[PDB]
Design a protein around this ligand. Sequence first.
Ligand SMILES: O=C(Nc1cc(Cl)c(O)cc1O)C1(c2ccccc2)CCC1
Ligand SMILES: O=C(O)CCC(=O)C(=O)O
Ligand SMILES: [Cl-]
Ligand SMILES: [Cl-]
Ligand SMILES: [Cl-]
Ligand SMILES: [Cl-]
Ligand SMILES: [Cl-]
Ligand SMILES: [Cl-]
Ligand SMILES: [Cl-]
Ligand SMILES: [Cl-]
Ligand SMILES: [Cl-]
Ligand SMILES: [Fe+2]
Length: 434
Amino acid sequence: LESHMTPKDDEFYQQWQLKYPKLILREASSVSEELHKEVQEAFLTLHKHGCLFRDLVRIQGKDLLTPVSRILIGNPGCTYKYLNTRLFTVPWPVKGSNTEAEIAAACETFLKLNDYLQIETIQALEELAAKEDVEVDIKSRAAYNVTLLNFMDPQKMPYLKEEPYFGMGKMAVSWHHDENLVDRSAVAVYSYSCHLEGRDPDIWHVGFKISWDIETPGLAIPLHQGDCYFMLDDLNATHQHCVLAGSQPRFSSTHRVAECSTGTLDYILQRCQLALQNVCDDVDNDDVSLKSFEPAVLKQGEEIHNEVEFEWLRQFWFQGNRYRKCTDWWCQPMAQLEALWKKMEGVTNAVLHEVKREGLPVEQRNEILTAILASLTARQNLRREWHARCQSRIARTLPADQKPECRPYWEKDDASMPLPFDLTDIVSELRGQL
Ligand SMILES: O=C(Nc1cc(Cl)c(O)cc1O)C1(c2ccccc2)CCC1
Ligand SMILES: O=C(O)CCC(=O)C(=O)O
Ligand SMILES: [Cl-]
Ligand SMILES: [Cl-]
Ligand SMILES: [Cl-]
Ligand SMILES: [Cl-]
Ligand SMILES: [Cl-]
Ligand SMILES: [Cl-]
Ligand SMILES: [Cl-]
Ligand SMILES: [Cl-]
Ligand SMILES: [Cl-]
Ligand SMILES: [Fe+2]
């Protein structure tokens, strides 16, 4: 028989205390009724403005539309990958300064909730540490830089997946870990919902289990309006969690310390400047001359080229639906990244030209090809993948306002670009020689 534990079961409590001590529940009553109202109306305002979107993600070769709609709010310039989709932050008013009045206010509210949750988390880590620069690690692991807001109306689904192991019933989100977070970083969630036998089907729960293990009955924790739960230290890594759907719609705010060593605007702009150091930079024109044709430098250049194109430009524009409707903060940055990428397209063309030059020893010519082939290979492959995703039946189903864009994209007819979109010819020709 497939079973789970709820607050009804006598054993729920010892299981929580003994097996899940890094799981904290702070009930609505513990949070000011003031913060509750401001946060809940912020949810409603974001919702009314149509700021939350479902995503057309890709999982194990599968194009799938997320039942849950979401928006990422957080530090200016920061990003967070979710299901292989790079979500771009709608900035909250962290010091420094930058949106439609109401949206800006709501972001300020979620920054406010962030401060609160952060302090609460530090509190819990300290009490957890006091159970047996360690303070640096504590603050470090509670320094939420992003929140992912989610919404689902279960009524809008024709059928929900059954929780497969413990008889927990309908799942809004199946068993997983929160990914791409700083090591051992906490996660804080603010949940906003509106005879027995097991967990109450009409009430939203968060479910927990130990990874690899379906022997130990999972925990189903009820989440009433305004309840908050925290995953501390290594809990998110050692355990899986799911969201069990109730009967009414529900929002949540999920504060995280996103790992961002390669996920900020500042970072990717620096990468671009690094690549462009191999380019004579007197004037911005169609004439691109390179300072060096050394293999190591050309390799790095084409890799950065790939990074900006696929991890940034493609990711952003595929999000057909989004920020022109919540921010436009990434407007200018994305125009700038594309112009940077544009110059790099000229860089590739200069390399290809040098590979052609009549007076170049086959030695140096092979060192160049052996250096850049792996990059131009991925460029071709990734370009096919991304083009297909924009044309999937699933994609052409979406309304006009959403439907993914394949930027940047151009036809041969176009002579503002130096190289073709399809490189298979150029790529094969390079391999043949080598
Ligand atoms: O959430 C998803 N699918 C889904 C889940 C539940 Cl729980 C449900 O009740 C109904 C659903 O359509 C996606 C998914 C997420 C991760 C891996 C595989 C698929 C499909 C796009 C997100
Ligand atoms: O909503 C929660 O309680 C956790 C976050 C979640 O399920 C999600 O990633 O959509
Ligand atoms: Cl634990
Ligand atoms: Cl609603
Ligand atoms: Cl920034
Ligand atoms: Cl600890
Ligand atoms: Cl912060
Ligand atoms: Cl609601
Ligand atoms: Cl694991
Ligand atoms: Cl993990
Ligand atoms: Cl430039
Ligand atoms: Fe989740």
